[PDB]
């Protein structure tokens, strides 16, 4: 059961959200 192990959401391709580029815009910063 290796293929199933690879399948699990645990190992789904994450992509880091942008800070300056396309998804840059944050309505409210981490602090005020």
């Amino acid at each position: 059961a290796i293929e199933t192990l690879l399948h699990d959401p645990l190992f789904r391709q994450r992509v880091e959200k942008n800070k300056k580029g396309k998804g840059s815009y944050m309505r409210k910063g981490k602090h005020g």
């Binding site: 690879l6 391709q13 994450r14 992509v15 880091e16 942008n18 396309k22």
Partner: protein
């Protein structure tokens, strides 16, 4: 003489290290009790038990005895050296220089023995690299991993061969089976089973976003013609498909795990190969089960942006990422072996 001098201390140090690794005190204790038991005449009345006891004792003695010898041999060598120094004679000096080598060799041998505890470490094995879910990136990562492993094999002096390869449409590989061949291959590679986390900025992506991909490697030794268990003809399914007619996939129903082969030219050859692979896999699974009875899957994280590779379980970091990629992974593997996971 300087090299000789260096060698005396170094050997001692390594012996010390070995002893520490062993945790010899416990062993000694075991031997003691066992010895006592042996000495008692009532143990030999029941034969099998007695035999078992005997078996237990000797190994314990021998490991411990070997250690003792090393301790003592080293001391003797040192004494000899001292004598040589005191009495300006060439022959004595020469003797001092020489005798140490043998001890060192012995120590090395012992260490090797310690390392490769499992029964099938000596035999050749089947590396199996399956790419992640992600997409193209995952495939690419898988391909890279494969490349790394092959280079490592080459460095070692291992004969590699691609049993199966499935390619990714854009780039990289979907999955790949590799047969490595040589002395004690599985003993090295069995540690490197598991998931490998690549973390880098994706060139296949249009934007410069930072992607996190995975790929499993899975290693199993070749156990053909030695092992008694065989696959049930009803549970075994054969299947044929096109090369990229020739290739053959095998499927096992109870466990629900498959193995394939496309390297051979005719069908018969392929099928046999598949069968061989499958049985090996089964054996591996059985042994794993046994281990479990006796008694997350991610093993390494290659972070190419920040330029650090860190084996998770062992806890060894390196910044020469490129080097590692090129097949300089020996370091990780040896650490893993030492750990004994």
């Amino acid at each position: 003489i300087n090299p000789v001098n260096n060698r005396i201390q170094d050997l001692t140090e390594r012996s010390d290290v070995l002893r520490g690794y062993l945790d010899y005190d416990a062993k000694k204790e075991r031997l003691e009790e066992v010895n006592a038991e042996l000495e008692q005449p009532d143990v030999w009345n029941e034969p099998e038990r007695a035999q078992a006891l005997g078996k237990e004792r000797s190994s314990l003695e021998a490991v411990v005895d070997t250690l003792d010898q090393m301790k003592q041999g080293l001391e003797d060598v040192s004494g000899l050296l001292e004598l040589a120094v005191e009495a300006d004679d060439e022959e004595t000096f020469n003797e001092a220089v020489a005798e140490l080598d043998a001890l060192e060799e012995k120590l090395a041998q012992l260490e090797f023995r310690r390392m490769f505890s499992g029964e099938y470490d000596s035999a050749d094995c089947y590396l199996d690299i399956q790419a992640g879910s992600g997409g193209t990136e995952a495939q690419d990562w898988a391909s890279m991993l494969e490349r790394m492993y092959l280079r490592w094999a080459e460095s070692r002096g291992f004969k590699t061969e691609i049993i199966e390869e499935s390619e990714g449409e854009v780039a990289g590989i979907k999955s790949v089976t590799i047969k490595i061949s040589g002395d004690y291959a599985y003993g090295w590679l069995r540690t490197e089973t598991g998931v490998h986390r690549l973390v880098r900025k994706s060139p296949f992506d249009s934007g410069g976003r930072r992607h996190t991909s995975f790929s499993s490697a899975f290693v199993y030794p070749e156990v053909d013609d030695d092992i008694d268990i065989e696959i049930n003809p009803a549970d075994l399914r054969i299947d044929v498909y096109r090369t990229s007619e020739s290739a053959v996939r095998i499927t096992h129903i109870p466990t629900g795990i498959v193995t394939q082969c496309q390297n051979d030219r005719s069908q018969h050859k392929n099928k046999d190969q598949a069968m061989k692979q499958m049985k090996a896999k089964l054996y591996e699974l059985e042994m794993q089960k046994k281990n479990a009875e006796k008694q997350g899957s991610q093993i390494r994280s290659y972070v190419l942006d920040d330029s650090r590779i860190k084996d998770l379980r062992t806890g060894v970091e390196t910044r020469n990422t490129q080097a590692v990629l090129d097949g300089s992974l020996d370091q990780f593997i040896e650490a893993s072996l030492k750990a004994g996971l």
